Amino acid sequence: GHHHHHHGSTTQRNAQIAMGRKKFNMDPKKGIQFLIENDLLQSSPEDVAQFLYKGEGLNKTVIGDYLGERDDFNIKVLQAFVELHEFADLNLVQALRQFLWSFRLPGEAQKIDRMMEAFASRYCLCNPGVFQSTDTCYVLSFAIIMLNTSLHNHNVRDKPTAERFITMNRGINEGGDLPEELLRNLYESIKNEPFKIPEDDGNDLTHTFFNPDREGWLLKLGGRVKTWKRRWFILTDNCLYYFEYTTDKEPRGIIPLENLSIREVEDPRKPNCFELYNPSHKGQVIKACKTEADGRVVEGNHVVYRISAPSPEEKEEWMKSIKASISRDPFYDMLATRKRRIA
Ligand SMILES: O=P(O)(O)O[C@H]1[C@H](O)[C@@H](OP(=O)(O)O)[C@H](OP(=O)(O)O)[C@@H](OP(=O)(O)O)[C@H]1O
Numbered sequence: 407g408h409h410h411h412h413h414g415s416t417t418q419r420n421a422q423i424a425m426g427r428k429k430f431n432m433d434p435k436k437g438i439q440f441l442i443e444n445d446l447l448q449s450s451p452e453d454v455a456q457f458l459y460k461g462e463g464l465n466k467t468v469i470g471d472y473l474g475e476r477d478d479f480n481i482k483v484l485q486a487f488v489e490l491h492e493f494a495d496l497n498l499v500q501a502l503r504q505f506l507w508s509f510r511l512p513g514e515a516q517k518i519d520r521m522m523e524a525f526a527s528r529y530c531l532c533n534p535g536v537f538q539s540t541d542t543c544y545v546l547s548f549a550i551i552m553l554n555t556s557l558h559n560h561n562v563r564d565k566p567t568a569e570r571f572i573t574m575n576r577g578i579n580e581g582g583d584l585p586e587e588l589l590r591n592l593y594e595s596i597k598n599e600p601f602k603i604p605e606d607d608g609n610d611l612t613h614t615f616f617n618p619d620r621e622g623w624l625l626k627l628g629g630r631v632k633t634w635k636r637r638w639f640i641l642t643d644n645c646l647y648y649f650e651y652t653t654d655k656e657p658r659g660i661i662p663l664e665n666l667s668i669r670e671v672e673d674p675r676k677p678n679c680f681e682l683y684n685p686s687h688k689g690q691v692i693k694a695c696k697t698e699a700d701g702r703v704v705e706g707n708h709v710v711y712r713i714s715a716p717s718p719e720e721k722e723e724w725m726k727s728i729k730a731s732i733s734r735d736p737f738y739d740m741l742a743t744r745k746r747r748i749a
Contacts, residue, residue, distance in 0.1 A: 422446060427463040434472035451479060455486035459508065466604045470509040474517025481520075488524045493532040497588070498543065499550055499595040501529050506601055511611045515737035518611070522547060538580035541744045546584070548615070548741060549575055550592055551601075555615045558600040562616070568593045580748055618738065620727050625676060625714040629707035634676065634714070643742050644731050646682075659696030661711060666692065668728045670721070676714035678721040682728075683710045 422444050430437025438454060441447035447457055458469050473484045491508070493501040505525050511518055526544040530537055537543045553571060556562045566574070571593045576583055601612045619642040625634050626648065637648040637658060646661040667685040684690050694706030715721035 419446075424463075431465045431468055434468050438472075451482035452486045454479075454483050455490060458483070459487055459490045461508070466508070467510040467512075470512045470517075470521070473509060474512045474514065474521055476516075476520075484521065484524050488528045491528065493529045496533070497591060497595070498529065498536075498546060499592050501525075501533075502547060502550060503601060506612065507604055510603070510605065513611075515735075515740060518737060519740055537584075538582070539748065541748050542579050542584075545578055545741065545744055545748065546575065546592075549578075550596060551612050551615050552617060553593065553596050554601050554612050556617070557597055559613055559616075568597075578748065618727065618730060618735070620724070622720070622724075624716075624720075624724070627676075627712040627714075641727060641731060644734065646728070656697070659694060659706065661692065661694040661706070663728065663732050666732060668725055668732070670725065671712065673712065673714065678715040678718050679712055680715070680721060680725050680728075681710045681712045 423446060426437055426441040426444065426446055428437075429440050438447065438457075441457070442449050447453060458464065458473065461469055472480060473487060474480075487508075488505075491501075491505055493504070496504070502525075509521075511521065522544055523540070526540050526547060530540055530543050537546070549571075553566065556566055568590050572586055572589045575589055578584060603610045603612060619640070621638070621640045623636055624639050626637050627634055637650065638652045638654075640647045640649070644663045646663060647657045648659050648661075649656075650658050661682065663682070665684055665686060666682050668680055668682055671679050671681045673679045682692065684692060689709055692706060692708050692711065694708065694711075695703055696706050697703050713724075715724055
């Protein structure tokens with residue numbers, strides 16, 4: 407008695423949908439074009455953004471690859487993608503949890519930057535008055551990411567306290583400090599739960615964002631006067647600073663490492679020695695500045711900086727660290743740039 411529906415075949419449409427997803431995961435530009443051609447997706451940046459945001463059956467590494475691109479279309483897709491996230495009334499960690507669930511960060515410095523700038527601009531728009539600049543939010547986002555790595559990667563030996571995290575971020579708010587309890591909250595949130603990463607292979611940026619900066623006592627030979635001194639060394643932003651005491655704010659000297667190289671050397675008296683030197687200008691005095699006993703600051707007089715480590719192991723570690731510093735990391739450098747701009 408009862409009539410029934412005419413249900414249409416869904417075989418071809420389902421096959422097309424699956425085909426499109428398969429193609430996307432191999433090549434996102436090709437997958438998207440296919441879906442548009444087969445009337446399964448509209449061609450506007452906002453429509454493509456919705457498609458990636460839902461991301462059904464889509465590889466989240468591939469989503470990140472596509473969103474990071476320089477192309478005019480991709481830039482608009484990214485902006486629309488970030489507009490689909492709701493950051494209002496979330497703290498920075500909570501907002502990053504949400505954002506970093508939607509895609510996996512690409513490996514290229516310029517791609518990471520475009521995506522994190524888009525994130526940071528959106529966070530600040532949805533949460534006015536929390537941060538003094540987009541730069542502050544961007545830099546704090548990476549301090550939170552670095553913290554995630556420090557607390558949760560077993561390869562990082564010395565785990566930061568809440569107080570270390572608070573003081574590390576002094577001055578970040580366009581020269582001023584963020585609220586102590588805000589920073590503490592961000593710290594405790596990360597400590598209590600690492601960033602949950604989709605399709606996690608254990609090699610994600612959020613788990614492997616290490617701090618390359620170093621410190622330690624070493625023995626150094628003088629310039630004109632060849633005397634050996636125990637000095638406290640700090641390596642940061644491709645410069646080597648040295649101090650009489652760990653408590654000094656004023657350095658004894660500053661050696662920019664740009665244009666330098668490092669080599670292991672034998673010394674008749676001191677073990678575990680290496681030397682900084684200019685490979686392009688043999689015999690030339692290395693540009694540096696240092697303080698004299700009377701408080702004057704003068705240029706260094708060194709052709710080489712010969713330095714002795716207490717063990718072969720520390721010699722090797724310092725050499726590796728200094729070499730890495732000189733070779734430079736493009737992303738670290740861009741972060742350094744924003745930090746200077748904040749100041
Ligand atoms: O203190 P005395 O025994 O007189 O010798 C000093 C120290 O070795 C200095 O090291 P530090 O600055 O660590 O105290 C060194 O400066 P550098 O730091 O440039 O190596 C001076 O080099 P000249 O100024 O080049 O002589 C040298 O005169």
